[PDB]
Amino acid sequence: QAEILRAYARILEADAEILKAQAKILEAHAEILKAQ
Amino acid sequence: QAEILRAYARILEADAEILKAQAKILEAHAEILKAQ
Amino acid sequence: QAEILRAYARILEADAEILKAQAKILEAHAEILKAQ
Amino acid sequence: QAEILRAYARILEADAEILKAQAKILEAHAEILKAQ
Amino acid sequence: QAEILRAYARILEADAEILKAQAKILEAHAEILKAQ
Amino acid sequence: QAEILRAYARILEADAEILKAQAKILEAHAEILKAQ
Amino acid sequence: QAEILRAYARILEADAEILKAQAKILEAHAEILKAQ
Amino acid sequence: QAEILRAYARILEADAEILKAQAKILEAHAEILKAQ
Amino acid sequence: QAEILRAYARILEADAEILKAQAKILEAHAEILKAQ
Amino acid sequence: QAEILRAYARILEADAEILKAQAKILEAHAEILKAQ
Amino acid sequence: QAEILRAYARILEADAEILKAQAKILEAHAEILKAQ
Amino acid sequence: QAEILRAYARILEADAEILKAQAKILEAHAEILKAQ
Amino acid sequence: QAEILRAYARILEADAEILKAQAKILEAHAEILKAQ
Amino acid sequence: QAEILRAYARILEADAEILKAQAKILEAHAEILKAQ
Amino acid sequence: QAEILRAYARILEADAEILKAQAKILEAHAEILKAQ
Amino acid sequence: QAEILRAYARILEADAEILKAQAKILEAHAEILKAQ
Amino acid sequence: QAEILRAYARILEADAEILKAQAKILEAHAEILKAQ
Amino acid sequence: QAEILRAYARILEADAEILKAQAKILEAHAEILKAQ
Amino acid sequence: QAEILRAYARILEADAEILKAQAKILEAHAEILKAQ
Amino acid sequence: QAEILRAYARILEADAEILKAQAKILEAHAEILKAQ
Amino acid sequence: QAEILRAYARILEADAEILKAQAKILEAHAEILKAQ
Amino acid sequence: QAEILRAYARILEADAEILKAQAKILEAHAEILKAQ
Amino acid sequence: QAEILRAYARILEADAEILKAQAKILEAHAEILKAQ
Amino acid sequence: QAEILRAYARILEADAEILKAQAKILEAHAEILKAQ
Amino acid sequence: QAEILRAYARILEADAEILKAQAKILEAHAEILKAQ
Amino acid sequence: QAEILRAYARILEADAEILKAQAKILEAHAEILKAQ
Amino acid sequence: QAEILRAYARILEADAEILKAQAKILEAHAEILKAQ
Amino acid sequence: QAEILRAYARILEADAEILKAQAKILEAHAEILKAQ
Amino acid sequence: QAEILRAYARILEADAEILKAQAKILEAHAEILKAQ
Amino acid sequence: QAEILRAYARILEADAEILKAQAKILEAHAEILKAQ
Amino acid sequence: QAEILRAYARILEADAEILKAQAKILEAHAEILKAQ
Amino acid sequence: QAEILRAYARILEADAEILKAQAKILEAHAEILKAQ
Amino acid sequence: QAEILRAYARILEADAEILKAQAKILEAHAEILKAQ
Amino acid sequence: QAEILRAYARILEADAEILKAQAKILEAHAEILKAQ
Amino acid sequence: QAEILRAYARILEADAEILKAQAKILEAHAEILKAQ
Amino acid sequence: QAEILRAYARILEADAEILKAQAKILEAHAEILKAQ
Amino acid sequence: QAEILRAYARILEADAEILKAQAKILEAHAEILKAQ
Amino acid sequence: QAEILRAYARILEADAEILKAQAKILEAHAEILKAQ
Amino acid sequence: QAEILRAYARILEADAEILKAQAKILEAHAEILKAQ
Amino acid sequence: QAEILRAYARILEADAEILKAQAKILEAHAEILKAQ
Amino acid sequence: QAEILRAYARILEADAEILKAQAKILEAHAEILKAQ
Amino acid sequence: QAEILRAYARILEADAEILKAQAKILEAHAEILKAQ
Amino acid sequence: QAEILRAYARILEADAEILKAQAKILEAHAEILKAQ
Amino acid sequence: QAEILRAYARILEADAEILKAQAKILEAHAEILKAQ
Amino acid sequence: QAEILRAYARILEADAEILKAQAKILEAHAEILKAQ
Amino acid sequence: QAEILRAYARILEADAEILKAQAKILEAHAEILKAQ
Amino acid sequence: QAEILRAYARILEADAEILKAQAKILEAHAEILKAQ
Amino acid sequence: QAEILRAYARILEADAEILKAQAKILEAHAEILKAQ
Amino acid sequence: QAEILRAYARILEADAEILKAQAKILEAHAEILKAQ
Amino acid sequence: QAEILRAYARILEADAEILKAQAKILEAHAEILKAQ
Amino acid sequence: QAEILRAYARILEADAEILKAQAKILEAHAEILKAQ
Amino acid sequence: QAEILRAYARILEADAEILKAQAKILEAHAEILKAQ
């Protein structure tokens, strides 16, 4: 049954990837504001 | 039933790819502003 | 029914490809501005 | 049975990754506020 | 049986990582408040 | 049998890491209160 | 047999680290009370 | 055999570290009471 | 054989460190009583 | 052979350190009684 | 040979330090009795 | 050869320090008896 | 050769210090008897 | 050559200090007998 | 040459100090006999 | 040349001090005999 | 030249002091004989 | 209830610190007047 | 109940510190008047 | 309610710090006048 | 029960300190009047 | 409501820091005048 | 039981200190009246 | 509303930093004058 | 509206950074003068 | 049992100190009346 | 309108960077003079 | 047993001190009456 | 119009980069002189 | 018109790159001198 | 056994001191009556 | 006309590339000297 | 006319390529010397 | 006439190709020496 | 005979190819598990 | 005969390839476990 | 004969490759244990 | 003949590579023990 | 002939690399012992 | 000829590297002994 | 000719590095002896 | 010509570094002797 | 010409550093002798 | 011209540093002689 | 012109420092003579 | 013009410091003569 | 105008300090003559 | 206007200090003449 | 107006101090004449 | 108004002090005339 | 109103002190005339 | 009302003191006339 538990770990890693991508969006806004 | 759970993980990874692409759009605006 | 869920994942990957292509358009504008 | 215990450790590491990503979101807000 | 004891040590290190990530969230709030 | 004794030392070091992380949480609250 | 005696010394150093971490928790409460 | 005697010295130094850490706990209580 | 005699001196210095740490505990109680 | 004689002097200095530490314990009791 | 004679002087100074430390113990008892 | 004569003077000064320390012990007993 | 004569004066001053210390011992006995 | 004559004066002053110290010993015996 | 004559005066004053110290010894015996 | 004459006066005053000190010795014997 | 004449007066006063001191010696013998 | 009584003692010590600081102000005026 | 009695002693010592500080204020006025 | 009383003590200590700082200003004027 | 009796002695010594401080206030007035 | 009272204490400590900084300015003028 | 008797002696010495302090107050009034 | 009060404390700390920086400028002038 | 007040604090911190940089310029002149 | 008898002597000396202090009070009144 | 105020803060930080760079130029001259 | 007899002498001397102190009280009344 | 103000900040940062590069040139001269 | 201002910033960054390249030339001379 | 006989002489001298003190009390009454 | 200004920036970047290439030549000489 | 200016930039980039190729020749000599 | 200028750029690129080919010859010698 | 030795090298390379192919089988299982 | 020595080097390189392939097998197991 | 010496270097490099491959095997076991 | 000396350097570098590979083996054991 | 001297430097650097690799082996043993 | 002198400096730096590596070996033994 | 003088300085700095490395060897022996 | 004089200063600083390194060697011997 | 005078000051400071280093050597001998 | 006068002051301060360093050498000899 | 007068004061203070350093040399000789 | 008058006072204080330093030299000679 | 009058008082106090320093020189000569 | 009158008193006290210092000079001559 | 009258008293006391200092000068001449 | 009358008494006491100081001057002349 | 009458008595006592001081002046003239 | 009558007695005693002082003046004239 350990397989299901690693599958939940896979979903939680995907949520971490979503939130890191939103962080990259806001860092790109910071680069736009620094470039001017 | 673990298969369905990995399929949800696949969808969440695709959402992460969408948000990374929007981050690349805004970084490209930053490169346009730095190039001038 | 997992098949339908992977098909939604296919559509979301295609949206990611669209947004990456717009990022490449704006990076090409940055290369035009750097080339002058 | 040690395998299950490492699987719980994998889930807890994934939770740590989620919270680090939220920290990166708020640090990116700090960079937006410093860039202006 | 020492293996199980190191596995408990792995879980406790993961709990330490969770709490360090919450500390990074609150330090990022401190950086937002200093940036204004 | 010394191996087991070092494994207990590993667990006690992990408990020390947990309590240091809680100390970092409260120091981050102190930084939030100083930043205002 | 000296090895076992140093292993007991390792455990006692880990107990010292635990109590120093609790001291850091209470010093962080002192910093919260000074920051207001 | 001098090695064993230095190992006993190592244990006694670790006991000194434990008691110094308890002294730091009570000094932190003193700082909490002075901060109010 | 002088080496053994310095090792006894090392043990006696460690006993001095233990008793100084207990003195620091009681001085910290004195600071708690003065802080109120 | 003078080396052995200085080693005895080292032991006697360590005994002096032990008794000074006990004096510091009792002075700390005096500070507790004065603080109330 | 004067070196040996100074080494005896070093031992006698260490005995003086021992007896001064016992004097400090009894003066600390005097401070405990005055503090009440 | 005057060096040896000053070394004897050093030993006699150390004996004076021993007897002054015993005088301080008995003066501390006098302070204990006056403090009650 | 006057140097040797001052060295004898140094020894006689050290003897005076020894006898003054014995006088201080007996004066401390007098203080013990007066304190009761 | 007057230097030697003052050095003899220094020795005679040291003898005076020795005899004054013996006088202080006997005065301390007188104080012990008066204190009872 | 007057310097030598004052140096003889210094020696005679030191002899006076020796004899005054012996007088103080015998006066201290008189105080011992009066104290009983 | 008057300086030499005052120096002789200084020597004669020192002789007077010697004889006064012997008078004090014999008066102290008189006090010993009266004290019994 | 009157200065020299006062210096002779100083010497004669010192001779008077010598003879008064011998008178005090013999009066002290008289006190010893009266004390018995 | 003794805690409240020590808290009143803390307030009275703070008043003493205020008045000592005013004394230091006027001593600094005295140093200005002495420096000219 | 002796604790309460020492707490009253602590308050009375604090009153003594207040009045000593007022004495230092007036001594500083005296130093200002002497400095002119 | 003792907490409020220590908070008043904190305010009075801050007033003491203000007045000590004004004393340091005037001592610095005294150092300027002494330096010339 | 002797402890209570020394505590009363502590209170009476504190009253003595209060009255000595008032004496120092009036001596400071005397110094102000002498300085003019 | 104690929080507001500590906030007033924070403001008064900041005023103390301002006045200490002005004291450091004038001490730096004193160092300029001493350096010449 | 002699301890209790010395404790009564301690109280009577404290009463003597109180009355000496009142004497110092009135001597300070005498100094104020002499200073005018 | 306590937030506004800490914000005023932040402004006053910034004024303290300005004045400390001017003090560092004048200390650097003092170092230039000492270096020659 | 507290945001505006922290923005004024940000400007005052930037002024502090300007003046610290001028202090570093003059300390570098001091290092040039010491290096020769 | 002689110890108890000296303790009674200590109490009687303390009574003598009380009455001498009252004598000093009345002598201070005499100084006030002479100062006018 | 707070945005404009942070933009002024950005300009003042850039001025601080200019002056720090001039300080680094003069420190590099100091290193050239020390290297010879 | 002579020790007990000297202890009775000590008590009788203390009674003499009490009565001399009462004599000083009445002489101080005489000084008050003469001062008017 | 804030955009223009950030553009001026961009120019001032570029001036800072120019002056840092000149500092690196002179530090490289210092390294040439140290390498020989 | 902001575009022209960023173009001037681009030219100033290119000047910074030129001067950094000259710094790299001189650091390479330093490496040649260290390699021998 | 002569020691006991001198101890009786010491007691009789103490009785003489008591009666002389009563004589001083009555002479002080005589001074009070003469002062009016 | 901004186009011409970016063309000047292109020329200045090419000059930077020339000077970086000369730096690489001299670093290659440094590698030849280190390889032997 | 901007075309001519980019053509000069093309020539300067070709000169950079020539000098990079000479750097690669000397790095290849360094590889020959390291290979032996 | 820009055509001629690009033709000179073509010749300079061909010279760069010649020198890169000589670099490849010497790197091939390095590979021969490493292969043995 | 070197030919046989290269033939053994050929066999060992073929074994390496077998094990790399099994690695590709398991990587293909990993791709199947990631594709769902 | 160097040819044989390079042939042994060829065999040892083939053994390295075998062990790298087993490492790739176990890394593929790690990828299977991460993919779930 | 240098050729033979480089051939021995080739064999030693092949042994290094074997041991690095065993290190990669054990790192792959570490990745398997982390993946669960 | 320098060629032979560099060939010995090549062999010693290969020995260094062997020992670094054994260090990597033992670090991989450390990673296996940390992963559990 | 300097070439030979740098070749000896190359050999000594290779010996340094050997001994650093043995240090890394023993640090890896330390990591194995800490990991348990 | 300075080149030869720097080559001797290169050899002495290589000897320093050898001895630092032996120091790292013994520090690694210290870490092994602390890890147990 | 100054170049030669700096080259001698380079050699003397290398000798300093050798002796510092021997100091680090003996400090590592001290750490081995403290670790047991 | 000042350059030569600073070069002599560089040599004298290098001699100071040599002697400080020998001091560190002997302090490390002191640490070895204290560690036993 | 002041530059030359500061260069002489630099040489004299270097001589001071040499003599301080010899003082540190002899203090390290003192620490070796105290450590035994 | 005041600059030259401060430069002479710099030289005289350097002479003071030389003589203080010789004083530290002789104090270190005193510590060597006391340590035996 | 006052600046020149303070510069003369600086020179006279430096002469005072020279003579104080010679006093410290001779006090260190006194400590050497007392240590034997 | 008072500034000039204080500058003359500064010079006279420096002369006082010179003469006090010569007094310390001669007191150090006195300590050398007493130490023998 | 009182300021000028205090400045004259400052000069007269400095003259007093000069003459006290000459008195200390001659008292040090007296100590040299007494020490022999 | 009383301030001016106290300033005249300050000058007259400074004249008294000058004449007391001359008295100390002549008393030091008296001590030189007595020391011989 | 009484203040002015006490200021005249202060001046007259300062005149008394001047004349007492002249008396001390002439008494010091008397001591010089007695010392010879 | 009695205050003014005591102020006149203060002035008359100061006149008495002046005339007593003149009496001490003439008594010092008498001592000079007796000392010769 | 008796206070005023004692104040007149104080003035008359001060007149008595003035006339006694004139008597001491004339007695000092008598001592000058007797000393010759 | 008797108090007023004693105050008149105090005034009449002060008149007696005035007339006794005039008698002492005329007796001092008698001593001047007898001394000649």
Can you tell me which residue has the tokens 């008995």?
L26
Determine whether the interchain pair P28/O33 forms a contact, defined as Cβ–Cβ distance below 8 Å: no
Query: Do AQ20 and AR23 touch, CB atoms closer than 8 A?
Result: no
In angstroms, rounded to a whole number, what is the distance separating the alpha carbons of residues V14 and V22? Answer: 13
Taking the CA of residue O21 and the nearest CA in chain AE, the distance in Å comes to 27
Q: CA nearest AO9: which of D6, AP16, AK34?
A: AP16
In angstroms, rounded to a whole number, what is the distance separating the alpha carbons of residues E7 and AK34? Answer: 11
Taking the CA of residue AX9 and the nearest CA in chain AY, the distance in Å comes to 5
> Which residue in the set L6, L16, L19 is minimally distant from M10, CB to CB?
L6
Q: How many CB atoms lie within 10 A of CB AQ19?
A: 20
Residue of U nearest to AW11 (CA): U36
Residue of AP nearest to I6 (CA): AP36
> Which residue in the set AI20, AI22, AI30 is minimally distant from AJ31, CB to CB?
AI30
Residue AC1 DSSP label: -
Q: Which residues contact AT11 (CB under 8 A, 6 or more apart)?
A: AS5, AS8, AS9, AS12
What ranges in AT1-36 are assigned the alpha helix state H? 2-35
Q: Which domain holds residue AY28?
A: 1-36
Q: CA nearest F22: which of G15, D20, H33, E21?
A: E21
Taking the CA of residue AS24 and the nearest CA in chain V, the distance in Å comes to 25
Q: CA nearest AB10: which of N30, AE9, N34, AE18?
A: N34
Reduce the DSSP state of residue M15 to 3 states and report it.
helix
Which residues in chain B have Cβ-Cβ distances shorter than 8 Å to C24? 28
Residue of L nearest to W13 (CA): L34
| The two structure tokens encoding residue AS36 | 């034997």
Residue AS4 dihedral angles phi and psi, to the nearest 5°: -65, -35
In angstroms, rounded to a whole number, what is the distance separating the alpha carbons of residues AV22 and AU22? Answer: 9
Determine whether the interchain pair G29/F33 forms a contact, defined as Cβ–Cβ distance below 8 Å: no
Q: CA nearest Z33: which of AX36, W29, U2, AU9?
A: W29
In angstroms, rounded to a whole number, what is the distance separating the alpha carbons of residues S13 and U13? Answer: 9
Can you tell me which residue has the tokens 């937002």?
E32
Q: Which residues contact I3 (CB under 8 A, 6 or more apart)?
A: H2, AP36
Query: Do B11 and C12 touch, CB atoms closer than 8 A?
Result: yes
The one-letter amino acid code at J32 reads: I
Q: CA nearest AJ30: which of AK21, AI23, AM35, E5?
A: AI23
Reduce the DSSP state of residue Z1 to 3 states and report it.
coil
Q: CA nearest K36: which of U8, L30, M35?
A: U8
What element of type H or E holds AV34? helix AV2-35
State the chains in contact with H (3 or more Cβ–Cβ pairs under 8 Å): G, I, T, AO
**C–AF contact: 3+ Cβ pairs < 8 A:** yes
> Which residue in the set AH12, AH24, AH30 is minimally distant from AG18, CB to CB?
AH12
Residue of AG nearest to AH35 (CA): AG35
Q: CA nearest AD12: which of AX24, Q7, AC20, AT14?
A: AC20
How far is CA N23 from its chain centroid?
7
Query: Do AK25 and AJ16 touch, CB atoms closer than 8 A?
Result: no
Residue AU1 DSSP label: -
Question: How distant, in Å, are the alpha carbons of Z29, Z32, AX7 from that of W30?
Answer: 8, 5, 15
In angstroms, rounded to a whole number, what is the distance separating the alpha carbons of residues AR36 and J5? Answer: 10
Which residues in chain V have Cβ-Cβ distances shorter than 8 Å to G36? 3, 6-7, 10
> Which residue in the set AP8, AP17, AP35 is minimally distant from AO30, CB to CB?
AP35
Determine whether the interchain pair AM3/AF36 forms a contact, defined as Cβ–Cβ distance below 8 Å: yes
In angstroms, rounded to a whole number, what is the distance separating the alpha carbons of residues AU12 and AU33? Answer: 32
Query: Do AG31 and AH27 touch, CB atoms closer than 8 A?
Result: yes
Determine whether the interchain pair Z19/AB24 forms a contact, defined as Cβ–Cβ distance below 8 Å: yes
Reduce the DSSP state of residue A36 to 3 states and report it.
coil
The one-letter amino acid code at K36 reads: Q
Taking the CA of residue Z22 and the nearest CA in chain W, the distance in Å comes to 7
Q: CA nearest Y29: which of AR11, AA28, AS4?
A: AA28
Classify residue Q31 by burial, with Cβ atoms within 10 Å: 0-12, 13-18, 19+: middle
Determine whether the interchain pair S18/R23 forms a contact, defined as Cβ–Cβ distance below 8 Å: no
The one-letter amino acid code at I10 reads: R
Classify residue K3 by burial, with Cβ atoms within 10 Å: 0-12, 13-18, 19+: exposed
Chain AR interface test: which of AQ3, AQ4, AQ5, AQ10 (most AR C-beta within 10 Å): AQ5
> Which residue in the set F12, F20, F27 is minimally distant from G31, CB to CB?
F27
In angstroms, rounded to a whole number, what is the distance separating the alpha carbons of residues AB16 and AB26? Answer: 16
Q: How was this structure determined?
A: cryo-EM
Which residues in chain AX have Cβ-Cβ distances shorter than 8 Å to AY8? 5
Residue of O nearest to N13 (CA): O14
Which residues in chain U have Cβ-Cβ distances shorter than 8 Å to AW3? 36
In angstroms, rounded to a whole number, what is the distance separating the alpha carbons of residues AO14 and AO7? Answer: 11
In angstroms, rounded to a whole number, what is the distance separating the alpha carbons of residues AB9 and AB1? Answer: 13
Taking the CA of residue X19 and the nearest CA in chain Y, the distance in Å comes to 8
Which residues in chain L have Cβ-Cβ distances shorter than 8 Å to W10? 35-36
Reduce the DSSP state of residue AN1 to 3 states and report it.
coil
Which residues in chain E have Cβ-Cβ distances shorter than 8 Å to F11? 5, 8-9, 12
Which residues in chain AQ have Cβ-Cβ distances shorter than 8 Å to AP34? 35
In angstroms, rounded to a whole number, what is the distance separating the alpha carbons of residues L14 and K9? Answer: 6
User: Which residues in chain AI precede a discontinuity of more than 2.5 Å between C and N?
Assistant: none
Reduce the DSSP state of residue AN36 to 3 states and report it.
coil
Question: How distant, in Å, are the alpha carbons of G32, L7, T19, AF33, AG29 from that of AH22?
Answer: 69, 84, 81, 21, 11
Q: CA nearest U15: which of S11, J31, R10?
A: S11
Determine whether the interchain pair AW29/AX32 forms a contact, defined as Cβ–Cβ distance below 8 Å: yes
Per DSSP, the residues of D1-36 read -HHHHHHHHHHHHHHHHHHHHHHHHHHHHHHHHHH-
Q: How many CB atoms lie within 10 A of CB AH17?
A: 11
Reduce the DSSP state of residue AX1 to 3 states and report it.
coil
Which residues in chain AO have Cβ-Cβ distances shorter than 8 Å to AC31? none
Q: CA nearest M25: which of K23, K12, N15?
A: K23
Q: CA nearest G7: which of T21, F5, AA6?
A: F5
| The two structure tokens encoding residue D5 | 């215990």
Reduce the DSSP state of residue E36 to 3 states and report it.
coil
In angstroms, rounded to a whole number, what is the distance separating the alpha carbons of residues X27 and AV33? Answer: 52
Q: Identify the sign of the CA torsion AJ15, AJ17, AJ22, AJ23.
A: positive
- Residues AP3-24 as b/e (b if ≥16 CB within 10 A, e otherwise) read eebbbbbbbbbbbbbbbbbbbb
Taking the CA of residue AS31 and the nearest CA in chain V, the distance in Å comes to 34
Which residues in chain Z have Cβ-Cβ distances shorter than 8 Å to M36? 3, 6-7, 10
Query: Do D24 and E32 touch, CB atoms closer than 8 A?
Result: no
In angstroms, rounded to a whole number, what is the distance separating the alpha carbons of residues AS23 and AT25? Answer: 4
Residue J26 dihedral angles phi and psi, to the nearest 5°: -75, -30
CA atoms within 13 A on the CB side of AH31: 6
In angstroms, rounded to a whole number, what is the distance separating the alpha carbons of residues AZ17 and AY14? Answer: 10
Q: Which residues contact Y5 (CB under 8 A, 6 or more apart)?
A: X4, X7, X8, X10, X11
The one-letter amino acid code at E6 reads: R
> Which residue in the set AB8, AB22, AB27 is minimally distant from AE31, CB to CB?
AB27
In angstroms, rounded to a whole number, what is the distance separating the alpha carbons of residues R27 and T26? Answer: 9
Q: CA nearest AI33: which of R12, AP5, AJ36?
A: AJ36
Q: CA nearest O18: which of J16, N9, H2, AA10?
A: N9
In angstroms, rounded to a whole number, what is the distance separating the alpha carbons of residues D17 and A17? Answer: 9
Can you tell me which residue has the tokens 């000679």?
AT29
Taking the CA of residue O36 and the nearest CA in chain AE, the distance in Å comes to 6
Residue of N nearest to AB5 (CA): N36
Q: How many CB atoms lie within 10 A of CB Y1?
A: 7
Taking the CA of residue A1 and the nearest CA in chain B, the distance in Å comes to 10
How far is CA AA20 from its chain centroid?
3
Taking the CA of residue K11 and the nearest CA in chain AR, the distance in Å comes to 10
CA atoms within 13 A on the CB side of B3: 9
Question: How distant, in Å, are the alpha carbons of Y26, AD21, AF2, AO11 from that of X35?
Answer: 12, 35, 51, 30
What ranges in chain AK are assigned the alpha helix state H? 2-35
Taking the CA of residue L12 and the nearest CA in chain AS, the distance in Å comes to 12
**AN–Q contact: 3+ Cβ pairs < 8 A:** no
In angstroms, rounded to a whole number, what is the distance separating the alpha carbons of residues AI2 and R9? Answer: 99
Query: Do AK24 and AJ20 touch, CB atoms closer than 8 A?
Result: yes
| The two structure tokens encoding residue O31 | 């105080």
| The two structure tokens encoding residue AQ18 | 């040499």
Chain P interface test: which of Q24, Q26, Q36 (most P C-beta within 10 Å): Q24
In angstroms, rounded to a whole number, what is the distance separating the alpha carbons of residues AB3 and B3? Answer: 106
| The two structure tokens encoding residue AP26 | 């002997």
What element of type H or E holds AF13? helix AF2-35
| The two structure tokens encoding residue AI35 | 């594709």
Taking the CA of residue AH21 and the nearest CA in chain AG, the distance in Å comes to 9
Residue of U nearest to AW5 (CA): U36
In angstroms, rounded to a whole number, what is the distance separating the alpha carbons of residues S32 and S23? Answer: 14
Name the CA radius of gyration of chain AE, rounded. 16
- Domain total in chain P: 1
In angstroms, rounded to a whole number, what is the distance separating the alpha carbons of residues M19 and N26? Answer: 11
Residue of D nearest to AA1 (CA): D36
| The two structure tokens encoding residue H13 | 């130094």
**H–AT contact: 3+ Cβ pairs < 8 A:** no
The one-letter amino acid code at AT30 reads: A
Q: How many CB atoms lie within 10 A of CB AQ3?
A: 10
In angstroms, rounded to a whole number, what is the distance separating the alpha carbons of residues AN3 and AM4? Answer: 13
Reduce the DSSP state of residue AF3 to 3 states and report it.
helix
Question: How distant, in Å, are the alpha carbons of R24, R32, S22, T32, U32 from that of S32?
Answer: 12, 9, 16, 18, 9
Determine whether the interchain pair AA8/Y11 forms a contact, defined as Cβ–Cβ distance below 8 Å: yes
Q: Provide the terminal-to-terminal Cα distance of chain AC, rounded to the nearest Å.
A: 55
Residue of M nearest to N12 (CA): M9
In angstroms, rounded to a whole number, what is the distance separating the alpha carbons of residues R19 and S25? Answer: 7
Q: What share of chain T is helix, strand, coil (3-state, %, to 5)?
A: 95, 0, 5
| The two structure tokens encoding residue AT33 | 């003569």
In angstroms, rounded to a whole number, what is the distance separating the alpha carbons of residues AG28 and AG34? Answer: 10
Determine whether the interchain pair AB16/AE11 forms a contact, defined as Cβ–Cβ distance below 8 Å: no
Residue AI27 DSSP label: H
Instruction: Give resolution in angstroms.
Output: 4.0
